[PDB]
Paper text:
Both structures are hexamers, with each monomer displaying the characteristic left-handed parallel β-helix domain of the acyltransferase superfamily of enzymes.
A trimer is present in the asymmetric unit but a hexamer can be generated using the crystallographic two-fold axis. There was density to support placement of substrate l-serine in two of the three active sites, with the third having weak density, where serine interacts with conserved active site residues. The model has an R and free R of 0.234 and 0.267, respectively. There are no major conformational differences between the l-malate and l-serine bound structures (RMSD 0.236 Å), where the main differences are due to the presence of open tail conformations in NgSAT. Comparing the two NgSAT structures, the active site residues, Asp96, Asp161, Arg196 and His197, interact with l-malate in a similar manner as the substrate l-serine. The terminus carboxylic acid group on l-malate and l-serine are co-ordinated by the Arg196 side chain. The negatively charged carboxylate side chains from residues Asp96 and Asp161 both co-ordinate the l-serine backbone amide and the hydroxyl group in l-malate. This difference is likely due to l-serine being a natural substrate of the enzyme, whereas l-malate is not.
Residue numbers in the entry:
A (entry chain B), D (entry chain B): 3 to 8, 11 to 189, 192 to 247
B (entry chain C), F (entry chain C): 2 to 7, 11 to 75, 77 to 189, 191 to 224, 226 to 249
C (entry chain A), E (entry chain A): 3 to 7, 11 to 248
Amino acid sequence: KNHLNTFDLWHTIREETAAAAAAEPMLASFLHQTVLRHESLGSVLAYHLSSKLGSPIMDVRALFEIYQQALGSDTQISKCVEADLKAIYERDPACDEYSLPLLYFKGFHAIQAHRINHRLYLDGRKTLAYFLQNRMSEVFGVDIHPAARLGYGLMLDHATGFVAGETAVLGNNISILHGVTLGGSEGGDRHPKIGDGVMIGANASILGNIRIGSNAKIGAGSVVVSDVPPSITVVGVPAKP
Amino acid sequence: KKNHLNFDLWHTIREETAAAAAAEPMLASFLHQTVLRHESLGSVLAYHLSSKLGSPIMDVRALFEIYQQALSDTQISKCVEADLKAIYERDPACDEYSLPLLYFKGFHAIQAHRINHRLYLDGRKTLAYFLQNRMSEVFGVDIHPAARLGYGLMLDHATGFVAGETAVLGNNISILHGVTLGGSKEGGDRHPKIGDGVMIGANASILGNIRIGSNAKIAGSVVVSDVPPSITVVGVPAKPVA
Amino acid sequence: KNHLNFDLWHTIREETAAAAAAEPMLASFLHQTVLRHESLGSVLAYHLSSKLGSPIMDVRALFEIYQQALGSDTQISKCVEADLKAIYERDPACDEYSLPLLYFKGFHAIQAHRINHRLYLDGRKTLAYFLQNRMSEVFGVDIHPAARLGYGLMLDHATGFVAGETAVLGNNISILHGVTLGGSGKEGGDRHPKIGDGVMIGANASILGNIRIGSNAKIGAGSVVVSDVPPSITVVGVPAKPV
Amino acid sequence: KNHLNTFDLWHTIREETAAAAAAEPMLASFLHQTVLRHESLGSVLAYHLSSKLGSPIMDVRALFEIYQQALGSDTQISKCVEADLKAIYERDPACDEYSLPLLYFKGFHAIQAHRINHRLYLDGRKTLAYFLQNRMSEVFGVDIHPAARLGYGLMLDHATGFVAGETAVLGNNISILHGVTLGGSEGGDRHPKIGDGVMIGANASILGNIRIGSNAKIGAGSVVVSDVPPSITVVGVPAKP
Amino acid sequence: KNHLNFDLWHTIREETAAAAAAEPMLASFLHQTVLRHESLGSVLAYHLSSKLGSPIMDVRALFEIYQQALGSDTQISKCVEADLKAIYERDPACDEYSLPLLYFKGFHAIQAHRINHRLYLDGRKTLAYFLQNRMSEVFGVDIHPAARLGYGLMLDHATGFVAGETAVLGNNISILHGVTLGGSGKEGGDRHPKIGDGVMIGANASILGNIRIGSNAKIGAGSVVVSDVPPSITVVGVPAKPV
Amino acid sequence: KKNHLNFDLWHTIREETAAAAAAEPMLASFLHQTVLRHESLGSVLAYHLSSKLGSPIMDVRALFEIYQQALSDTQISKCVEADLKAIYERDPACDEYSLPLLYFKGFHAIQAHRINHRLYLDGRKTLAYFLQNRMSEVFGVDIHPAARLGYGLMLDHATGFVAGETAVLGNNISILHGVTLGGSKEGGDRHPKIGDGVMIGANASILGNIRIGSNAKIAGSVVVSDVPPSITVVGVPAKPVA
């Protein structure tokens, strides 16, 4: 029972986690607290992100409420979350259940955390946004600037070392592997703009204010420095069509 | 340097740690608790790994007991010792055996994965995924529990190492940080199979269900095809060059 | 109002007072980390101990150790002040001085390494290795305590930086994340790069072996240098080639 | 501006704590998190009790939600809380502000914690009630059995060592000092029944299923073993009119 | 189904399985504390270490220390089993055996003291004092490690119990909270009460000095005994007097 | 027994703690951190008190700095030493000076109150109340910050000690656990004033604004009237008897 078959994402996740809780008594109270006691997927996400990023400095209850108010202020974030989960199930062979990336894929956590961060930054809570950016970098190994604008349908697989700068913009239905850099090169627009459908391979660098066309493919380890036409595969250092 | 290439690994480690404990009073109770109070190397490893990966969610006592019950698989301890010896052999920055045991996160990631693999094969999949995620957070190393790892492994520096579900590694292999043993929507074998003796340089990507031959040499390269034994491949994309 | 227009410490205190007044969630944190301190170095010791403290190593003890270290070599504080200024110069994402001080893990990794180097030279090797491992865990940055780093350093984003035992870095250098200053061989001795003043290294660049990198050279992103590089040369490719 | 003068309890507490937060920068984020960010007194109470009684075993977020749902299920508990605060302001010379016992009087915390405990016990959550009873005993030094029934207007001053058994019942507007025992003497009714208005002195023992009349006064250190008529002062070991 | 109608351990495991199934908030806690263990003594060591552990003293280390202690003197476990049965006998509020095991701080204080006494006799005096202080903080109960306690003990409610260095308690005794088994004088030696089998002491009763309390005596609540008490006598008052 | 009645308190404490640290490896890093790494007794006291009373809300580093800045009042350290000597004099269970310093919660409650009193007089009332509540939770001792305490105090066992806002205690006093120095709606002086040399037995209640004379002796008694000097009072209610 999946979305490319039948469907309720939330109900399916609850059934999966109920099975898991019954199977592993070591984690049951965790799964009841993180998931089963909640009434919406967004509440679960806020709770788990607060567990990940909480500190003595930033109480987990306070961060939980902040993420809850954020998700309730911006309804589109929950839509993006659900889209990303569906994308991970579609594209990742290692994903056999929906709760799997929800609970255990640090790239998914980094992306959704950034979404909330972006919401806080736009509201003027810049200091808190920087605090959470630093904490996301520490715990997830992923540095996304709060100003970065990311679309829906994103899968950040493995994730370790992903960087996205202040002025980066990503379209919808994009797949990024670990080690990828969407880096800069004086302020202003200076970070990549990635189009819908693009797939970026592991340890690929995309530098500067350059456009990457729809359904382009950036090979693993490549270094892109100029714009890339849509539907082109570029490979090499520097990358070439 | 009374070492294995000049012997009791466990006794040597205990002597090193006794010296350290006497020297640094800030860490002595730590070294007594992690090492000196234990009767076997495997118990020390379980204790330290649980210290690293423990959380409020997962009590350190429970994780310690789980790792000891796992260590059921006596051969894992053998692999641990092998890996330690390899690190002493191959790493110039390793002058003592307790050094990687306590402070090298690549060694910790590899041994943690070994225990994880044991838990996964026994059907404790949820805990295996939980611990995989925690290994990724604390060590910066993502090894899928299904991955099959041989003995004599050295993962130096480690930050960013990835190994997918279907990856298989032989014996006496040396991997640097940033290395990717990655895949290429459809399941099945899709992660590299690395042969005994191979050396992979930093930030090297090996993608897909491809075989890497005995004593091959792969820094920064991107392999997409199989590699014959005893070949040095370099470049993006990789090409034989030696 | 910046250093190119000045007291770094006073400016940082003003910025942090503004932030504390703005965010009530973080006010006590900013008062404890910054406003209650009398010197920038004390703030640095406090924040680093907050980052790297553990149940094994009490934060009060690590704080005192970092304080005694900074007092042992006053010049370390100078380097700290240099590095902050460098980031303000070179990083477009840096609009305030307390920003990297509090939230840039590369800056924290560099200063932590400085203190580590001080402890290692004093013979506190076990603690140096402990803190190296902890820096690797929390920051994702592996710098060997023996590594020699000059002033004016910016380690942007930082995740995955590695620098071995015999690495030496000059002054006014800019390094991005994923960069490797790595070694070669099983035999000890000089085997890690020596980077000259002014060099810029792009993301995920590997520099391997006991090789010299000349003044104001530029190592392109993703490049792999295995030979020495003349001064004022841009090298690109795998392996890197002059251009 | 007090209740025996003018009045909004909640607004007054918020003003007091805003003053405190502005005065002590060491505690400001605490006072914003415990009080100023909340919309009702009951939410503040749930939060602070969760801070007190939270553990690694029992996450503070989970306990916070449990106390919130409890207070929302039983509206009378909040009324009792407000009554108790007013009683402490009335009767305790050391209470010059309303937020003072709210945040810093462990007897007040023990009483309100017990109220929530009683709610959980009546709902059948007996194991959780026992867990929280043990934790209240550890942190507050106060052992109140979850089944005990306590009225409103209670002040438990200093509190250390207060004990109240399974079948104890306390009326309204009662004042109890530290060390007081409402103890037993085979099951069944075996714990005191205390009437409205009674004042019990420090280290006084009241043992058995005995009635204590309205507006009685039990002297400090006394040991009561028989019923006490209303409006009588009893003192001694054993206590005598 | 109780011990007066039997396996204590099996009954406790059944009770805790029921509780775990009933309360999902506490299931992993009950599995870790009880169900994953193979003996009651292991459960006791685990729970006591949970109570008394700290950042200074790792819970794994304290757990191992309590385990080794219990293994050093198997008879301690017998006393534990005795005490639990006593509470079930004597406490109306006890309807299950795991109830005092998990939630009665007097039971925890008594068993903690037993292990403490074992460590003290073995010469681990510094740790014994550490754990005495920690027991005093968490349980509100001060028992000197040298104190000698028999089996069949019920310390109900417990808050404020004190027993000095030279105190000795027989078997099958019932003590309420606030009770003092205290000393007198600045000179060491025997100076703390010796209580005989069967005695019942009421809440906030003080028994001071090196005085013997006879078999099956009853010390009324709030009483202050300063002289020896004959067996099978009820004493009441301040100071206590026969009745 | 090289002691003060047979001298350097600080050096003796350091020697005792060095012996203990060498003997118990489980606590050595603790004893080095709490005591041996410090240069003065007052710093040790600030460190240990912050360890006891620290929380996630109140960082131990901040509380440590606050206690050191308080200790501004040099005389407090004198009182600390006096109290320690008293405990050695009067308590048979005290054979070493570091014993109450590290493990006697009555000593900790008294010294914590001293610092609290200093903070309260300086106007840091909110923090004083916070720390009073924490002292009540951790030590089971409720001392109002306004309470005025003399030197040479021994609070043995301590659990349940209460001292109200207007209480005043002289010098060289011995108090057992459960003792109440309580009050009796209207503010003003309403808590006992205890004279030098007095001894109060366990679970004794002294209520109201009443004077207790020099070298008076009060276990379980309830005093409601003033007590002349050099009188033993016993009973509920209390009566002179010796």
